[PDB]
Symmetry: C3
Subunit: 289 residues, 3 copies
């Protein structure tokens, strides 16, 4: 069986003083199509493959192509994946929950470099022999993630730096906990990064959370992000504040809101301020199909 799913999003993206002779406000949009082939068996083992076709405004050649494939095998709560995999630091829960606006961005997200699923082709040729293996398991309300990424599988392994990561999250109805660690993140020797987060569902309506990072070799240093959200009917309000160790950085912050216009249709906007005082704002829609 082959299924197709995806989403479109478009709206206004504003970046204060974007650049000499550049407009500060543009129309930023994205079309994402996922192509999934699955083979179910009577033995309970499911095999699958996926491809993504993603277009973003500004893309080179005004064209869209597929990325590199991902393959998986699932059996009894265990999933093994190969090729262009989802990585542990990028898949744990809570680490991206301060994101807001129609482009789901936040200066409070980790400031480090690490491998993650590649949505598009890479013209530099850097990903041509990139191959990963990942294993996930949901044991109880516990989720475990493991990933191994080799940036160039064809070359003798002693010449390349491979990325290894682990993560786990756990949740009941009101508290959630998550942690991750990855060594040689992004294939950079000694760029070891870690995450610990927790969130409290202080209502069916509200949530407050705190994420802490060790950003490895990034110039940002350690980081802490405190964020929260509250739902009022169809509208959700969100906010966050984040600090990094880099000398002289400002405190980043943002405030935004989502409006659930209909099932699959979300209108969002946000106003944020970064670590270097950058001012960014957005407003737009996302529709799922």
């Amino acid at each position: 069986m082959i299924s197709l799913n995806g989403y479109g999003r478009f709206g206004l993206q504003y970046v204060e003083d974007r650049g000499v002779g550049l407009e500060d406000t543009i129309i930023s949009s994205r079309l994402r199509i996922n192509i999934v082939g699955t083979t179910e068996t009577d033995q309970g083992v499911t095999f699958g493959a996926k491809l993504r076709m993603q277009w973003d405004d500004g893309d080179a050649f005004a064209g869209t192509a597929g990325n590199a494939a991902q393959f998986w095998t699932s059996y009894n709560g265990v999933t093994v994946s190969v090729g262009n995999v989802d990585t542990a630091f990028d898949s744990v829960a809570l680490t991206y929950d301060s994101e807001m606006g129609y482009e789901a961005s936040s200066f409070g997200d980790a400031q480090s470099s690490f491998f993650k699923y590649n949505s598009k082709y890479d013209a530099s040729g850097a990903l041509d022999n990139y191959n990963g293996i990942a294993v996930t398991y949901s044991i109880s309300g516990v989720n475990l993630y493991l990933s191994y990424v080799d940036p160039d599988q064809t070359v003798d392994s002693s010449l390349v730096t491979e990325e290894f990561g682990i993560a786990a999250d756990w949740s009941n109805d009101m508290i959630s906990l998550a942690a991750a660690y990855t060594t040689d993140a992004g294939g950079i020797v000694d760029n070891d990064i870690a995450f610990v987060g927790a969130a409290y569902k202080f209502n069916d309506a509200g949530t407050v959370g705190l994420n802490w990072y060790d950003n490895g070799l990034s110039t940002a240093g350690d980081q802490v992000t405190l964020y929260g959200n509250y739902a009022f009917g169809a509208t959700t309000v969100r906010a966050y504040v984040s600090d990094i160790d880099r000398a002289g950085a400002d405190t980043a912050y943002g405030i935004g809101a989502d409006y659930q216009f209909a099932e699959g249709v979300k209108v969002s906007g946000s106003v944020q301020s970064g670590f270097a005082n950058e001012t960014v704002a957005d407003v737009g829609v996302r529709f799922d199909f």
Copy 2:
């Protein structure tokens, strides 16, 4: 929801004396696939996105890719679109009704340069930040079209020439009228073009029409095209004659026929002669799927 539709066409395309050491007759073919994602809401607002994958014989690299996306929102007869939009001069009725043959061509089509939906990627990099906005409305048997195209939305607007167009068409059972105007067509300063057309359905079987253009800065100058068609059962016969102001140009003309072999299957051919005496002929099929 995601739907796929398209067509294939193949046949013979002949160009008298195409070129030194070139064959005059080749097999010209096209495969077009449209990918449409839509999200319907109970509020009556529909959101959609579309992507096209088009291959034509002769294309570079013997490969096919997607173009740049188009997004829209429809509500009560009004449609707003963003990104790679359909433009007003390219969408009005009547302006392409002299086209004939399996590749739907005509020297009687307007000889000017103007933006229109881009079916494919552009290797020159000229379309990378091209973004348009369009609005259509069917008020009665009236159709109104408006389009705004910015060839490079990232650059300060005083440095770029934007294209603005309007058009309207109207029809009852026997007369149709259409007009369009576009300023700085194709992003070329002072290339302002206009169209006025009318057609008379002198039967359930026949139609005669006349289109007039102002081709802006093109060397063709003003143009007039008189065309007609008549249906005899499953076969339709078509003809046209067109004249442009360019000094020394010949009168262009063409005669062709369509045969409706079955629903979705059309066999067509034509013999045409251009403004510079070029002789072109074709015969082939198109099937819709």
Copy 3:
């Protein structure tokens, strides 16, 4: 109507002493998606078009694109195809039946160069104006194939070498016979190649066969491949031995097995040795969707 089908395969591919500073064992995988549009008519003539999107590990840019299209028309057992066609030497039965392992390879396959359906784009620009025509017919348990491939249809024909091929196969329940011949194979003047094969189904379970080739201008010279397979429940065992005329070449051979894990899911592996003593091995899965 538009349908999508395909397969994914992944596993380990081992090549003894692949190269200085290279790993001998890598994870080799492929994702293939076929896009087929068809228009059926009440007259019994079916029209179709197809596109392929294929990704293999190692591909340039870590991306996937469509290839060049293929068009066909079928009526009463006769199929005419145009564009990126299937060729006669590549479509006859028996010629690839010694292939084994999850990547279906065999040194016993013909060692010659000839045109065949192109699964992907070609960055060299060599296929940009490549166009073929093919005709197939199943008259009784007989299959006939004819193909004509012009490597550059736009250029005067006396300047290009076109490939012409024919083939036929025939089968009852226990014997199969096949033959093919192609002149100027692969567009190489005087590279004329031929195939004759026969197979004996000495059981419902076993088969032994013999293929003979004339490899035209290849340095391999004439070749003979003797192969066999035997099914034991869900597992199939296969073997082959092949010899070529090239002076000093070794005898190639291989042994492998397939395991039908479920409908659409096949686990395969093989160990093979080539004409230059290369040692290659594989183990992996293929799933159809």
